[PDB]
From Swiss-Prot, chain A:
The chain holds residues 263 to 370 of 370 of the full protein. This is NSFL1 cofactor p47. One of its GO terms (cellular component) is chromosome. Its main location: nucleus. It comes from the Eukaryota. Phosphorylated during mitosis. Phosphorylation inhibits interaction with Golgi membranes and is required for the fragmentation of the Golgi stacks during mitosis. Residues 29-106 form the UBX domain. Changing residue 81 to S: Reduced interaction with VCP. Belongs to the NSFL1C family. Part of a ternary complex containing STX5A, NSFL1C and VCP. NSFL1C forms a homotrimer that binds to one end of a VCP homohexamer. The complex binds to membranes enriched in phosphatidylethanolamine-containing lipids and promotes Golgi membrane fusion. Interaction with VCIP135 leads to dissociation of the complex via ATP hydrolysis by VCP. Binds ubiquitin and mono-ubiquitinated proteins via its N-terminal UBA-like domain when bound to VCP. GO terms for molecular function: ATPase binding; lipid binding; ubiquitin binding. The gene is Nsfl1c. Reduces the ATPase activity of VCP. Necessary for the fragmentation of Golgi stacks during mitosis and for VCP-mediated reassembly of Golgi stacks after mitosis. May play a role in VCP-mediated formation of transitional endoplasmic reticulum (tER). Inhibits the activity of CTSL (in vitro). Together with UBXN2B/p37, regulates the centrosomal levels of kinase AURKA/Aurora A during mitotic progression by promoting AURKA removal from centrosomes in prophase. Also, regulates spindle orientation during mitosis. The lineage of its organism: Eukaryota, Metazoa, Chordata, Craniata, Vertebrata.
From Swiss-Prot, chain B:
It comes from Homo sapiens. Phosphorylated by tyrosine kinases in response to T-cell antigen receptor activation. Phosphorylated in mitotic cells. ISGylated. Transmembrane segments: none annotated. ATP 1 binds at residues 224-230. Changing residue 228 to Q: Impairs ERAD degradation of HMGCR and does not inhibit interaction with RHBDD1. GO terms for biological process: aggresome assembly; ATP metabolic process; autophagosome maturation; autophagy; cellular response to arsenite ion; cellular response to heat; cellular response to misfolded protein; cytoplasm protein quality control. The chain holds residues 24 to 269 of 806 of the full protein. This is Transitional endoplasmic reticulum ATPase. The PIM (PUB-interaction motif) motif mediates interaction with the PUB domain of RNF31.
Length: 108, 246
């Protein structure tokens, strides 16, 4: 449907960008750590590196810092099978049931 | 991945329950492409991470993969991440149990399209699931194999309509489920059989510790009339070897 982004980045800098995006999110050891799983629909690659309590805007910041391909491309994440979308980007993970939930990069 | 299973909640494979503290303990990937294994060498892929109705350490699977890959409720369910598969193009138009109970029509728009919520069927091309609109008891065997491995399909392209009914005999004709419990108490010699087939049981590693395999060839001795077909088929679908009886 919509235009996507191919593998335009270097293979040797993807792990460095993933480490930079992992270090961008603050890590606290006083909370039960929730492993938020994100899979993008631009080829099937998927990573996970997160803390316990954050926001959906922090997930968008993690996606922007992970790769420079979809940083400027408009994208709306979603959860599969409530038939719902992921609005209210300032909401936390526990209130909107984002505890390790399905995140699918959908391009509009 | 060896853990106890939850009881049934719904009757759809397009909704699957979830145990989130156990996924916090384990490592499972996203959603639609997650492998589950088990009996009869049957690898299966469907959705997880969708409903979250039950509690931790027990997860509901669909009934068509409750009877398949296990024996009953209370068994050990296993999970496996199988991501990054490709996209298929309109798997089966052909159901195999209840085509004549009703009307054919377009043969895939009638029953698949009211009964999905963007779950584009990542099931084995030849595997079963009950799907119909009203009566909700129509299985299928997939004949359209546009992707080779376990893959989801693209949303709503066009295919042919060559679906014809067959009697539902294929699963117990070719993949008849038998286990250790399905032979009526031969454990004086069933243990000996299990000892003899354990080195064929997916194990090349102990062949250097055994020298030559003591099963060069095994003879079954029994009275005329006891039957040996299911006894010889017991190692089929428990080892996963190619049976090919003649
Ligand atoms: N020891 C046994 N345990 C369970 N079923 C048996 C046993 N012996 C015979 N049968 C039954 O006899 C029937 C016909 O036997 P046959 O097909 O000749 O070989 P097999 O006995 O290996 O199945 C089968 O339906 C099978 O269930």
């Amino acid at each position: 449907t919509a235009p996507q982004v191919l593998n335009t980045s270097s293979p040797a800098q993807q792990a460095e960008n993933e480490a930079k995006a992992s270090s961008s999110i603050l890590i606290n050891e006083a909370e039960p750590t929730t492993n938020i799983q994100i899979r993008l629909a631009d080829g099937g690659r998927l990573v996970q590196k997160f803390n316990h309590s954050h926001r959906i805007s922090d997930i968008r910041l993690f996606i922007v810092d992970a790769r420079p391909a979809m940083a400027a491309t408009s994208f709306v994440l979603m959860t599969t099978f409530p038939n719902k979308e992921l609005a209210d980007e300032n909401q936390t993970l526990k209130e909107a049931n984002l505890l390790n939930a399905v995140i699918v990069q959908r391009l509009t | 991945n060896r853990l106890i299973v939850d009881e049934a909640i719904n009757e759809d494979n397009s909704v699957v329950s979830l145990s989130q503290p156990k996924m916090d303990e384990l490592q499972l990937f996203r959603g639609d492409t997650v492998l589950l294994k088990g009996k009869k060498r049957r690898e299966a892929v469907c959705i997880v991470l969708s409903d979250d109705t039950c509690s931790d350490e027990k997860i509901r699977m669909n009934r068509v993969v409750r009877n398949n890959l296990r024996v009953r409720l209370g068994d050990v369910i296993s999970i496996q991440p199988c991501p990054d598969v490709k996209y298929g193009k309109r798997i089966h138009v052909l159901p195999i149990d209840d085509t004549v109970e009703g009307i054919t029509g377009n043969l895939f728009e009638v029953y698949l399209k009211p009964y999905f919520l963007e779950a584009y069927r990542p099931i084995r091309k030849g595997d079963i699931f009950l799907v119909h609109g009203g009566m909700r008891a129509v299985e299928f065997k997939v004949v359209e194999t546009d992707p080779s491995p376990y893959c989801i399909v693209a949303p709503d392209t066009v295919i042919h309509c060559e679906g014809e009914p067959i009697k539902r005999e294929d699963e117990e004709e070719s993949l008849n489920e038998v286990g250790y419990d399905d032979i009526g108490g031969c454990r004086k010699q069933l243990a000996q059989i299990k000892e003899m087939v354990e080195l064929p049981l997916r194990h090349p590693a102990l062949f250097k510790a055994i020298g030559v395999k003591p099963p060069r060839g095994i003879l079954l001795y029994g009275p005329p009339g006891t039957g040996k077909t299911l006894i010889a088929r017991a190692v089929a679908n428990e080892t996963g070897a190619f049976f090919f009886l003649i």
